Amino acid sequence: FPPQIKVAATYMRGGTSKGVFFRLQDLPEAAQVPGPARDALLLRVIGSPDPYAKQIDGMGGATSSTSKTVILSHSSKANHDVDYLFGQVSIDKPFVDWSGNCGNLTAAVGAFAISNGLIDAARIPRNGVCTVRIWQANIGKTIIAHVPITDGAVQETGDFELDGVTFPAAEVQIEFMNPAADMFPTGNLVDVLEVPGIGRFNATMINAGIPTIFINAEDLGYTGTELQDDINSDNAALAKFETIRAHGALRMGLIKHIDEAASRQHTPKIAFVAPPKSYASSSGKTVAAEDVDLLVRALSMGKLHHAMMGTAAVAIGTAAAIPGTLVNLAAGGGEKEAVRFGHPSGTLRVGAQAVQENGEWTVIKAIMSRSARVLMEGFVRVPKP
Amino acid sequence: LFPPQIKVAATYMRGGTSKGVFFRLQDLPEAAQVPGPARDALLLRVIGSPDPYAKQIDGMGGATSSTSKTVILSHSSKANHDVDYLFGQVSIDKPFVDWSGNCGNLTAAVGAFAISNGLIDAARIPRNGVCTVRIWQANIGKTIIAHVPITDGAVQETGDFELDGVTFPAAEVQIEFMNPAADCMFPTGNLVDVNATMINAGIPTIFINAEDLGYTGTELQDDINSDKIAFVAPPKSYASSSGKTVAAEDVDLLVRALKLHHAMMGTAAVAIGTAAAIPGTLVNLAAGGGEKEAVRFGHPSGTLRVGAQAVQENGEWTVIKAIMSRSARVLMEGFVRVPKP
Ligand SMILES: O=C(O)CC(CC(=O)O)C(=O)O
Numbered sequence: 001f002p003p004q005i006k007v008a009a010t011y012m013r014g015g016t017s018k019g020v021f022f023r024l025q026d027l028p029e030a031a032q033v034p035g036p037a038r039d040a041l042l043l044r045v046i047g048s049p050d051p052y053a054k055q056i057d058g059m060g061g062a063t064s065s066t067s068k069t070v071i072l073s074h075s076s077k078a079n080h081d082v083d084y085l086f087g088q089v090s091i092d093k094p095f096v097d098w099s100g101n102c103g104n105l106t107a108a109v110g111a112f113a114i115s116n117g118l119i120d121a122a123r124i125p126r127n128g129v130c131t132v133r134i135w136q137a138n139i140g141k142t143i144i145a146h147v148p149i150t151d152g153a154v155q156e157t158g159d160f161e162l163d164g165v166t167f168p169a170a171e172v173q174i175e176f177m178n179p180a181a182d183m184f185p186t187g188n189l190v191d192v193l194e195v196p197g198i199g200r201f202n203a204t205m206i207n208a209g210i211p212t213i214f215i216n217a218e219d220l221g222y223t224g225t226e227l228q229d230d231i232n233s234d235n236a237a238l239a240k241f242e243t244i245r246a247h248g249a250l251r252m253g254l255i256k257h258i259d260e261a262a263s264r265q266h267t268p269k270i271a272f273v274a275p276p277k278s279y280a281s282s283s284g285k286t287v288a289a290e291d292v293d294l295l296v297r298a299l300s301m302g303k304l305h306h307a308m309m310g311t312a313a314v315a316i317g318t319a320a321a322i323p324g325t326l327v328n329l330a331a332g333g334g335e336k337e338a339v340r341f342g343h344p345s346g347t348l349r350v351g352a353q354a355v356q357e358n359g360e361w362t363v364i365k366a367i368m369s370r371s372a373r374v375l376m377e378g379f380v381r382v383p384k385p
Numbered sequence: 386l387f388p389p390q391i392k393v394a395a396t397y398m399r400g401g402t403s404k405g406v407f408f409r410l411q412d413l414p415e416a417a418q419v420p421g422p423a424r425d426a427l428l429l430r431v432i433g434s435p436d437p438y439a440k441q442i443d444g445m446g447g448a449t450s451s452t453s454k455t456v457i458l459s460h461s462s463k464a465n466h467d468v469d470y471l472f473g474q475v476s477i478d479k480p481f482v483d484w485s486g487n488c489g490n491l492t493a494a495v496g497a498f499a500i501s502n503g504l505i506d507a508a509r510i511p512r513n514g515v516c517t518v519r520i521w522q523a524n525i526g527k528t529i530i531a532h533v534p535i536t537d538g539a540v541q542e543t544g545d546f547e548l549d550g551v552t553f554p555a556a557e558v559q560i561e562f563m564n565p566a567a568d569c570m571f572p573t574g575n576l577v578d579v580n581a582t583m584i585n586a587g588i589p590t591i592f593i594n595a596e597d598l599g600y601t602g603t604e605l606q607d608d609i610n611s612d613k614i615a616f617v618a619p620p621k622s623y624a625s626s627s628g629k630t631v632a633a634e635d636v637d638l639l640v641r642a643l644k645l646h647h648a649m650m651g652t653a654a655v656a657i658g659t660a661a662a663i664p665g666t667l668v669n670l671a672a673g674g675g676e677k678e679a680v681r682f683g684h685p686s687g688t689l690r691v692g693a694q695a696v697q698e699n700g701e702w703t704v705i706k707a708i709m710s711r712s713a714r715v716l717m718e719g720f721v722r723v724p725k726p
Pocket residue numbers: 016017018064065066068102103104105299300301308309310311
């Protein structure tokens with residue numbers, strides 16, 4: 001029984017999520033390429049697989065917002081500063097999912113890169129804003145993070161509030177470039193998902209941020225004001241969502257056989273939308289109807305998400321900008337350059353201007369602000385591989 | 386964009402009355418060197434599944450349970466074992482690889498593959514004679530011993546040993562399924578339940594009397610398949626699927642197993658021999674009752690003899706091993722291809 005190994009790492013909050021962040025060069029040699037050695041290390045760091053579903057024996061917190069890893073490296077892509085690989089660590093299975101971006105940890109990626117020698121020092125001012133050009137390596141997309149700098153170091157602290165983040169910190173503006181996959185895989189703004197013997201559901205299926213299925217709250221008997229406790233103990237509801245998600249995955253061409261959905265839980269995401277309505281958020285704060293353009297709730301690994309996934313926020317903004325999508329309609333229809341949506345923890349504004357070219361809509365970028373901070377830095381430990 | 390197909394070193398083999406694609410663990414793409422979606426996805430594509438056409442024309446499968454099969458072998462780090470054996474039964478119609486059981490037929494080829502591919506210490510291989518290969522069956526956590534003939538330091542594949550259901554004769558490979566009873570033999574605690582004998586030996590198997598399901602025990606595939614569980618009957622003469630007459634005198638009982646299997650599953654043959662040795666099971670009764678250390682049974686493709694001696698002490702029966710002979714040969718060796726994962 002050899003001593004545990006030590007691996008340099010930084011535990012950070014990015015937006016409304018937490019994860020363990022590594023520089024590629026700090027990983028054990030065998031883990032410096034994708035594969036089982038890398039996955040085994042990350043699983044052990046986080047505390048997975050865990051039959052108890054508590055992650056008491058790792059850095060995870062036993063939720064999709066806390067069972068998370070990030071590997072950053074100098075980029076070899078033209079006009080980029082840092083390569084960003086995100087691994088969503090399964091709680092119950094010996095599996096790390098590399099198929100998506102985390103749009104919340106994106107907020108921390110810029111800061112980690114600056115703080116850890118991954119960005120050309122010529123690009124970092126003594127004071128001001130360091131524009132970090134991120135190559136999102138899971139999905140092959142450019143993300144720009146504007147990270148504030150004070151005295152040659154990341155300015156972490158500040159007074160910017162993000163609903164779902166307990167305490168304010170410095171604002172970090174994020175720009176998801178050319179978000180459309182690599183927009184509407186079915187070729188339609190709205191489809192009907194026919195789930196034989198369970199119902200038929202109007203849906204907008206969109207590939208922007210992450211592949212996402214939006215359905216109307218009303219078609220599920222919901223209002224869009226639901227909090228976690230309204231849904232997460234309702235196994236019938238959970239099973240219904242999953243069958244609809246599976247059928248949408250099939251319709252989007254993401255899977256060829258319906259049974260593939262059981263082992264592909266990360267994408268596509270499923271969410272439901274509704275017109276503005278007042279509600280008390282999870283924090284006790286009242287979100288008034290007038291505060292939002294629409295309501296959106298989303299599922300994450302089969303349970304109602306506590307706030308909204310960052311990738312889903314990109315999908316909401318992008319869909320809202322396309323007249324006729326269910327997201328656009330929930331927001332009242334017509335052209336829209338931005339929307340504020342209500343999720344369980346409060347509200348978020350996303351900007352996404354669509355422009356016609358050759359009679360078709362295109363979206364240059366989806367923009368939103370988050371914040372980030374270091375929680376713990378040093379070395380994580382695991383038993384010797 | 387469309388990247389080239391990847392190449393994965395593999396051997397396509399007949400083991401007993403089945404065919405499968407065999408891999409050394411280390412030859413798999415890294416992603417597939419641990420259990421999980423990447424492994425299952427790769428195996429499905431190698432075999433040609435899932436296939437809505439049910440023909441497997443786009444992979445190595447043959448569109449039957451006896452031909453939609455994969456095997457992953459590696460040198461064992463377990464005390465007293467040479468080779469670790471993982472068997473994957475690949476669904477024809479669904480995106481599923483079933484890891485819940487052993488293949489008793491491909492078991493025969495595992496020993497040969499292990500010798501031929503450096504998975505057994507060379508010190509344990511005679512130059513001429515018989516190499517005893519200790520197999521850890523990793524799906525079910527059981528030891529299986531294979532006695533593989535060796536000539537000039539290589540596996541002796543060819544020979545004159547005949548297996549009903551195998552077209553051409555080949556070298557005899559003697560197989561020993563050690564302590565086949567699950568860690569129990571009769572999960573219900575009874576030899577016969579309400580009527581079925583349910584036994585966990587080789588593979589969990591439900592045995593029912595042919596007469597009670599509306600059959601005789603002489604059925605061939607075409608009697609059922611256009612219309613584990615197995616049905617049993619006393620000896621009766623029939624034409625096998627090859628046209629050869631199996632005379633009633635040639636067998637102790639008839640066994641058909643489920644699609645109706647073309648011959649008999651190797652694991653089911655273990656269940657049959659084991660159950661036959663326990664006085665009072667439906668299998669034992671079909672063979673005329675009393676103590677039995679071996680039975681020959683009639684299946685659609687001919688007959689098979691299995692040995693299993695049971696010993697009684699303090700009202701309980703135990704079986705040290707079930708034994709049978711099979712054969713195996715390499716059909717094709719090289720690289721299989723699938724699109725880049
Ligand atoms: O992607 C998810 O399902 C979960 C996420 C991503 C996000 O919130 O941005 C999480 O909870 O961290």
